[PDB]
C-alpha positions as a Python dict, from the first residue, in 0.01 Angstrom:
ca = {
    (1, 'H'): (0, 0, 0),
    (2, 'A'): (178, 202, 269),
    (3, 'F'): (558, 206, 237),
    (4, 'K'): (741, -71, 428),
    (5, 'P'): (1109, -150, 496),
    (6, 'G'): (1275, -293, 191),
    (7, 'D'): (1059, -97, -61),
    (8, 'L'): (1268, 45, -348),
    (9, 'V'): (1207, 403, -452),
    (10, 'F'): (1338, 717, -598),
    (11, 'A'): (1360, 981, -323),
    (12, 'K'): (1364, 1358, -369),
    (13, 'M'): (1568, 1586, -147),
    (14, 'K'): (1595, 1958, -235),
    (15, 'G'): (1926, 2015, -411),
    (16, 'Y'): (1959, 1664, -559),
    (17, 'P'): (1806, 1478, -857),
    (18, 'H'): (1544, 1215, -769),
    (19, 'W'): (1770, 949, -618),
    (20, 'P'): (1778, 563, -607),
    (21, 'A'): (1699, 466, -247),
    (22, 'R'): (1515, 232, -18),
    (23, 'I'): (1305, 235, 289),
    (24, 'D'): (1503, 119, 593),
    (25, 'D'): (1407, -43, 928),
    (26, 'I'): (1478, 185, 1224),
    (27, 'A'): (1797, 93, 1417),
    (28, 'D'): (1737, -35, 1772),
    (29, 'G'): (1846, 289, 1947),
    (30, 'A'): (1820, 534, 1661),
    (31, 'V'): (1627, 861, 1625),
    (32, 'K'): (1266, 793, 1520),
    (33, 'P'): (1145, 973, 1203),
    (34, 'P'): (898, 1271, 1228),
    (35, 'P'): (522, 1199, 1174),
    (36, 'N'): (447, 1038, 836),
    (37, 'K'): (818, 1011, 762),
    (38, 'Y'): (1054, 719, 685),
    (39, 'P'): (1429, 640, 714),
    (40, 'I'): (1536, 651, 354),
    (41, 'F'): (1873, 489, 275),
    (42, 'F'): (2026, 654, -41),
    (43, 'F'): (2218, 412, -270),
    (44, 'G'): (2563, 518, -385),
    (45, 'T'): (2631, 771, -107),
    (46, 'H'): (2485, 537, 165),
    (47, 'E'): (2340, 830, 363),
    (48, 'T'): (2009, 799, 548),
    (49, 'A'): (1755, 1082, 589),
    (50, 'F'): (1390, 1117, 673),
    (51, 'L'): (1137, 1176, 397),
    (52, 'G'): (764, 1155, 352),
    (53, 'P'): (566, 984, 69),
    (54, 'K'): (525, 1301, -135),
    (55, 'D'): (901, 1265, -212),
    (56, 'L'): (896, 885, -252),
    (57, 'F'): (842, 730, -594),
    (58, 'P'): (825, 351, -651),
    (59, 'Y'): (1140, 244, -833),
    (60, 'D'): (1003, -8, -1091),
    (61, 'K'): (743, 239, -1222),
    (62, 'S'): (960, 556, -1210),
    (63, 'K'): (1296, 428, -1354),
    (64, 'D'): (1219, 544, -1710),
    (65, 'K'): (1179, 897, -1574),
    (66, 'Y'): (1444, 913, -1302),
    (67, 'G'): (1700, 634, -1358),
    (68, 'K'): (1906, 789, -1639),
    (69, 'P'): (2273, 858, -1543),
    (70, 'N'): (2415, 1181, -1410),
    (71, 'K'): (2754, 1300, -1277),
    (72, 'R'): (2623, 1393, -931),
    (73, 'K'): (2858, 1219, -689),
    (74, 'G'): (2747, 867, -587),
    (75, 'F'): (2446, 874, -825),
    (76, 'N'): (2562, 628, -1088),
    (77, 'E'): (2696, 401, -810),
    (78, 'G'): (2351, 438, -658),
    (79, 'L'): (2191, 322, -990),
    (80, 'W'): (2424, 19, -989),
    (81, 'E'): (2333, -81, -631),
    (82, 'I'): (1954, -47, -672),
    (83, 'Q'): (1966, -260, -989),
    (84, 'N'): (2218, -520, -872),
    (85, 'N'): (2217, -554, -494),
    (86, 'P'): (1946, -336, -338),
    (87, 'H'): (1905, -531, -21),
    (88, 'A'): (2282, -544, 64),
    (89, 'S'): (2384, -385, 399),
    (90, 'Y'): (2641, -134, 268),
}
């Protein structure tokens, strides 16, 4: 299974803990991601950034490892949104 819009993941950016997020559809006129990269929408903070699969972990199967709370800003809000309303627009 290649990643598709709507997929729920944890995403890793340098600097941050693995982060509740989802794969987004590309906006009509928006910048296209680099090769083998996706628009990742980060729950809680609502930022979007491009990432490849090496930093993308499926959410169901990785929650035990990554979905414990922490005081990084927006993180716990991000946990709430992925569990409760992951396909909302925010």
